């Protein structure tokens, strides 16, 4: 999993999600990255899920980079309880993701091989995705 | 970053400045002693009486007592009575003290 080992407050507000991403819009370490196309709350259990996927795809090899880190606490009321009497309890953590953000990028492996281990990676993901190539544009910022 | 010297200035300086009444700054080196009356609004000098321009010499303290009395004449003739005393980063005593007692007896008002 991926808890932030420590934190300033425990329960976090919910928040909107208006518009286009803030940063993380260019490859930076790998040579191929995975790109978000629609807003989301990606979960500690998904990030992990997608990661493990590729690692088991090119077993012994590559270097997986992971650009979004689940810091926000997903909160939720128990079952058979009604509205109010406290705010929900924490179960799991998430990372806010807008469209354009890179989430994974792998470095150093056969072009075919990265193009799969990032393809499979997307299916573990709750959203639409596009794989991308490191770029003159990317090295241009 | 600051020296205790310049802090003491501001300190002693700041208060007096808040009461509006005129300002008789007292500068003092190991050689001579100087002074000048200042309106701090416009930021201008009313009259300046110094040990060096007066060309006096013959013991530093007693030197000053005259330069104080000198300042009063050169200002009474101008119309100043009300003026509060700035004693710089110096303890009011002896040399600076003299300048005051001189200005005091010359008819000046603080």
């Amino acid at each position: 999993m991926l808890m932030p080992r420590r934190m300033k407050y425990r329960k976090q507000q919910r928040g909107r999600l208006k518009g286009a991403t803030k940063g993380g819009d260019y490859v930076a370490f790998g040579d191929f990255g995975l790109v978000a196309l629609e807003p989301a709350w990606i979960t500690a259990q998904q990030i992990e899920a997608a990661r493990v996927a590729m690692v088991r795809h090119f077993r012994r090899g590559g270097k997986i980079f992971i650009r979004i880190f689940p810091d926000k606490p997903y909160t939720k009321k128990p079952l058979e309880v009604r509205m109010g009497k406290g705010k929900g309890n924490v179960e799991g953590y998430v990372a806010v993701v807008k469209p354009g953000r890179v989430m994974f990028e792998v470095a150093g492996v056969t072009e075919e091989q990265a193009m799969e281990a990032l393809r499979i990676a997307g299916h573990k993901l709750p959203i639409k995705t596009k794989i991308v190539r490191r770029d003159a544009y990317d090295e241009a910022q | 970053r600051l020296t205790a010297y310049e802090r003491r200035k501001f300190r002693v300086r700041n208060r007096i400045k808040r009461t509006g009444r005129l300002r008789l700054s007292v500068f003092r080196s190991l050689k001579h002693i100087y002074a000048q009356i200042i309106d701090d609004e416009k930021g201008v000098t009313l009259v300046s009486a110094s040990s060096l321009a007066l060309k006096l010499k013959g013991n530093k303290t007693e030197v000053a007592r005259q330069v104080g009395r000198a300042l009063a004449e050169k200002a009474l003739a101008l119309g100043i009575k009300q003026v509060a005393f700035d004693r710089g980063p110096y303890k009011y005593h002896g040399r600076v003290k003299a300048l005051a007692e001189g200005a005091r007896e010359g008819g000046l008002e603080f």
Binding site: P78, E80, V81, R82, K85, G86, K87 | -
Partner: protein, 84 residues
Amino acid sequence: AHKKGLGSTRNGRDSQAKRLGVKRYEGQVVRAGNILVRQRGTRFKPGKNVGMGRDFTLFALVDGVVEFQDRGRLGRYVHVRPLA
């Protein structure tokens, strides 16, 4: 039913709003005494014709007109240029 045996909270309060801020805006004609500004701390400093009470409440010392001056590193000041 529906209500059963949950629980509650440990927190839940809040203090009475203090309604502070700048009370007089620059160019407002003031009587002597008007509170120009309410505050905690010195976010504004006492200028010409302006006092300060044991709660940093600045107040006009003579009739005139509020003026506002940001003198940078030594802060904002509030004065009154008494229309004579």
